[PDB]
Design an enzyme around this catalytic site. Structure first.
Site, mmCIF file in Angstrom:
data_model
loop_
_atom_site.group_PDB
_atom_site.id
_atom_site.type_symbol
_atom_site.label_atom_id
_atom_site.label_comp_id
_atom_site.label_asym_id
_atom_site.label_seq_id
_atom_site.Cartn_x
_atom_site.Cartn_y
_atom_site.Cartn_z
ATOM 1 N N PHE A 59 0.857 -1.176 0.000
ATOM 2 C CA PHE A 59 0.000 0.000 0.000
ATOM 3 C C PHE A 59 0.895 1.229 0.000
ATOM 4 O O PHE A 59 1.772 1.377 0.852
ATOM 5 C CB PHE A 59 -0.918 0.004 1.224
ATOM 6 C CG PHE A 59 -2.034 -0.997 1.141
ATOM 7 C CD1 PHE A 59 -1.769 -2.362 1.190
ATOM 8 C CD2 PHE A 59 -3.349 -0.575 0.981
ATOM 9 C CE1 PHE A 59 -2.800 -3.295 1.078
ATOM 10 C CE2 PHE A 59 -4.385 -1.498 0.868
ATOM 11 C CZ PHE A 59 -4.110 -2.860 0.917
ATOM 12 N N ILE A 61 0.180 5.106 -0.128
ATOM 13 C CA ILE A 61 -0.730 6.242 -0.133
ATOM 14 C C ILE A 61 -0.006 7.526 0.254
ATOM 15 O O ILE A 61 0.938 7.507 1.047
ATOM 16 C CB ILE A 61 -1.919 5.992 0.835
ATOM 17 C CG1 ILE A 61 -2.925 5.031 0.192
ATOM 18 C CG2 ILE A 61 -2.613 7.301 1.181
ATOM 19 C CD1 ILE A 61 -2.384 3.650 -0.095
ATOM 20 N N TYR A 64 3.985 8.210 0.617
ATOM 21 C CA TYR A 64 4.659 6.921 0.527
ATOM 22 C C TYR A 64 4.877 6.418 -0.896
ATOM 23 O O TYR A 64 5.601 5.442 -1.107
ATOM 24 C CB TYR A 64 3.913 5.863 1.344
ATOM 25 C CG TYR A 64 4.127 6.007 2.833
ATOM 26 C CD1 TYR A 64 3.454 6.983 3.565
ATOM 27 C CD2 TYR A 64 5.038 5.193 3.505
ATOM 28 C CE1 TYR A 64 3.684 7.148 4.930
ATOM 29 C CE2 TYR A 64 5.278 5.348 4.868
ATOM 30 C CZ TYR A 64 4.598 6.328 5.573
ATOM 31 O OH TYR A 64 4.836 6.489 6.920
ATOM 32 N N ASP A 132 7.952 1.278 2.533
ATOM 33 C CA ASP A 132 9.151 2.036 2.905
ATOM 34 C C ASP A 132 10.252 1.083 3.358
ATOM 35 O O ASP A 132 10.754 1.153 4.486
ATOM 36 C CB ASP A 132 8.845 3.070 4.002
ATOM 37 C CG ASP A 132 8.111 2.481 5.197
ATOM 38 O OD1 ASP A 132 8.104 3.135 6.259
ATOM 39 O OD2 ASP A 132 7.529 1.382 5.084
ATOM 40 N N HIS A 152 9.501 -9.677 14.868
ATOM 41 C CA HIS A 152 9.790 -8.246 14.919
ATOM 42 C C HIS A 152 11.263 -8.078 15.313
ATOM 43 O O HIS A 152 11.725 -8.688 16.275
ATOM 44 C CB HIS A 152 8.868 -7.587 15.949
ATOM 45 C CG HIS A 152 8.933 -6.092 15.956
ATOM 46 N ND1 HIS A 152 7.825 -5.297 15.753
ATOM 47 C CD2 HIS A 152 9.969 -5.247 16.170
ATOM 48 C CE1 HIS A 152 8.176 -4.026 15.844
ATOM 49 N NE2 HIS A 152 9.471 -3.969 16.096
ATOM 50 N N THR A 164 4.884 -5.890 23.279
ATOM 51 C CA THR A 164 3.901 -4.814 23.299
ATOM 52 C C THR A 164 2.542 -5.244 22.748
ATOM 53 O O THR A 164 1.962 -4.570 21.896
ATOM 54 C CB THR A 164 4.400 -3.570 22.520
ATOM 55 O OG1 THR A 164 4.696 -3.925 21.163
ATOM 56 C CG2 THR A 164 5.649 -3.003 23.175
ATOM 57 N N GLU A 222 -1.225 -4.540 13.751
ATOM 58 C CA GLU A 222 -0.190 -5.418 14.279
ATOM 59 C C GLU A 222 -0.637 -6.141 15.547
ATOM 60 O O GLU A 222 -0.301 -7.310 15.758
ATOM 61 C CB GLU A 222 1.077 -4.607 14.549
ATOM 62 C CG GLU A 222 2.217 -5.398 15.157
ATOM 63 C CD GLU A 222 3.514 -4.624 15.129
ATOM 64 O OE1 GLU A 222 4.171 -4.604 14.066
ATOM 65 O OE2 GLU A 222 3.868 -4.019 16.163
HETATM 66 C C1 LIG Z 1 13.448 5.165 16.865
HETATM 67 C C2 LIG Z 1 12.154 4.435 17.172
HETATM 68 C C3 LIG Z 1 12.323 2.961 17.697
HETATM 69 C C4 LIG Z 1 11.129 1.888 17.535
HETATM 70 C C5 LIG Z 1 11.497 0.413 17.995
HETATM 71 C C6 LIG Z 1 10.312 -0.548 18.247
HETATM 72 O O1 LIG Z 1 9.773 -0.652 16.887
HETATM 73 C C7 LIG Z 1 8.387 -0.309 16.819
HETATM 74 O O2 LIG Z 1 7.647 -1.333 17.500
HETATM 75 C C8 LIG Z 1 6.229 -1.082 17.509
HETATM 76 C C9 LIG Z 1 5.595 -2.156 18.373
HETATM 77 O O3 LIG Z 1 6.142 -2.143 19.686
HETATM 78 C C10 LIG Z 1 5.700 -1.078 16.076
HETATM 79 O O4 LIG Z 1 5.948 -2.341 15.479
HETATM 80 C C11 LIG Z 1 6.426 0.005 15.278
HETATM 81 C C12 LIG Z 1 7.938 -0.219 15.355
HETATM 82 O O5 LIG Z 1 8.623 0.863 14.695
HETATM 83 C C13 LIG Z 1 8.873 0.690 13.337
HETATM 84 O O6 LIG Z 1 9.794 -0.406 13.174
HETATM 85 C C14 LIG Z 1 11.058 -0.180 13.842
HETATM 86 C C15 LIG Z 1 11.889 -1.432 13.657
HETATM 87 C C16 LIG Z 1 11.742 1.068 13.269
HETATM 88 O O7 LIG Z 1 12.055 0.850 11.901
HETATM 89 C C17 LIG Z 1 10.815 2.281 13.396
HETATM 90 O O8 LIG Z 1 11.409 3.408 12.767
HETATM 91 C C18 LIG Z 1 9.460 1.979 12.749
HETATM 92 O O9 LIG Z 1 8.567 3.052 12.999
#
Ligand SMILES: CCCCCCO[C@@H]1O[C@H](CO)[C@H](O)C[C@H]1O[C@@H]1O[C@@H](C)[C@@H](O)[C@@H](O)[C@@H]1O
Ligand SMILES: [Hg+2]
Ligand SMILES: [Hg+2]
Ligand SMILES: [Hg+2]
Ligand SMILES: [Hg+2]
EC number: 2.4.1.40
Length: 264
Positions: A59, A61, A64, A132, A152, A164, A222
């Site tokens: 996707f 949008i 992006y 992205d 993850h 989380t 998620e």
């Molecule tokens: C600088 C910000 C750190 C974020 C680390 C944890 O990742 C995030 O986890 C939440 C669930 O807890 C969700 O999955 C978004 C995720 O953030 C994205 O993925 C990570 C790996 C980084 O690439 C972030 O920039 C993304 O926004």
């Protein structure tokens, strides 16, 4: 189905573990895909003999759409090379989709957003990812299975209590502290068309219920994906090699390859 042809490759070693640093099979006997566990030649043969077609959905949008060029160009170099691939780009800016050159047997369809029956007749498997990102190494048929989730990158070494997950019982995505196998990232999942549609239908319905009860899961889609995969175990789990962020997490020893990464 059809017999494999004669092939010459190293004999598997019964008394030698693939990896002594990571878990390579889940407790429900689903393989966890890490480099060093599979022979891609055998797998390529198996899936090519079935003339497998893989659909890759993304996707894009608003702003992006800017990530599409790099995403598609790198997918052409690393994603399912040698197999039939059908890209499905869902966007609100059709004219903004870049004209990327595709290899033979690969096609791209642009779907403007403002029937799922199509997927059932056009592809065998569906792979759903975020745009992205960029492919940096091999991502092939080793991931194909009825249903798969991806670990993850930020939580593969965490205890379930630290995951989380949505913790409010009022949400359909609720998962208590004493439950949970892994924390899957919503940016990379897939499986057979049937299993992917079952998952998306289930999550869509759960989200509607939450909306009606005035609650939104902590990590939205998620959170629901994690609840679904907890109750419906994936038949394969992809290691963080398949969903990484090198700027944020570097290149740990546990990763022999960085295959699909976030774009800074
Ligand atoms: C600088 C910000 C750190 C974020 C680390 C944890 O990742 C995030 O986890 C939440 C669930 O807890 C969700 O999955 C978004 C995720 O953030 C994205 O993925 C990570 C790996 C980084 O690439 C972030 O920039 C993304 O926004
Ligand atoms: Hg091995
Ligand atoms: Hg999808
Ligand atoms: Hg769900
Ligand atoms: Hg979902």
């Amino acid at each position: 189905m059809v017999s494999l042809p004669r092939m010459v490759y190293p004999q598997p070693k019964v008394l030698t573990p693939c990896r002594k640093d990571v878990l390579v099979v889940t407790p429900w006997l689903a393989p966890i895909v890490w480099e060093g566990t599979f022979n891609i030649d055998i797998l390529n043969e198996q899936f090519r003999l079935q003339n497998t077609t893989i659909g890759l959905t993304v996707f894009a949008i608003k702003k992006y759409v800017a990530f599409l060029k790099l995403f598609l160009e790198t997918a052409e170099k690393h994603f399912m090379v040698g197999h039939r691939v059908h890209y499905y780009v869902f966007t609100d800016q059709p004219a903004a989709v870049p004209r990327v050159t595709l290899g033979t047997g690969r096609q791209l369809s642009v779907l403007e957003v403002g029937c799922e029956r199509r997927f059932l007749s056009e592809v065998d498997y569906l792979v759903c990812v975020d745009v992205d990102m960029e492919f940096r190494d091999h991502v092939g048929v080793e991931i194909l299975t009825p249903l798969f989730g991806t670990l993850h990158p930020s939580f593969y070494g965490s205890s379930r209590e630290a995951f989380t997950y949505e913790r409010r019982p009022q949400s359909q995505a609720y998962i208590p502290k004493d439950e949970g196998d892994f924390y899957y990232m919503g940016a990379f999942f897939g499986g057979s068309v049937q299993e992917v549609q079952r998952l998306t239908r289930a999550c869509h319905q759960a989200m509607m219920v939450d909306q009606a009860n005035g609650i939104e899961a902590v990590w939205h889609d998620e959170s629901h994906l994690n609840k679904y995969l907890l109750r419906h175990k994936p038949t394969k789990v992809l290691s963080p090699e398949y969903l990484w962020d090198q700027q944020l997490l570097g290149w740990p020893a546990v990763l022999r390859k960085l295959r699909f990464t976030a774009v800074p």
